[PDB]
Design a protein around this ligand. Sequence first.
Ligand SMILES: Brc1c[nH]nc1-c1ccncc1
Length: 93
Amino acid sequence: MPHAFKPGDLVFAKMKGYPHWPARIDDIADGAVKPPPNKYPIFFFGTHETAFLGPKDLFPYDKCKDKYGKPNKRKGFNEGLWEIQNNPHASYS
Ligand SMILES: Brc1c[nH]nc1-c1ccncc1
């Protein structure tokens, strides 16, 4: 039964103008910028960009991969598909 989102959870994250994108709930490093209240730091695979999102835009990866996990022409998307499937918890800095 679902819990709240926690660092390390794998998701598809929805941003305006982008398809649902392979992503993870990031950790917040010591001394790093914290997200606004009720928002999570979302690390987008492939592009390696971060955005702050609420749960309305976060879809669990295992439940939605058959819907959202197909190749896409957008820059970084297919690289992101490889990352979320093959090394989702690695450091991509
Ligand atoms: Br959606 C997506 C995939 N990679 N990066 C993004 C993104 C776009 C804009 N602001 C933050 C993150």
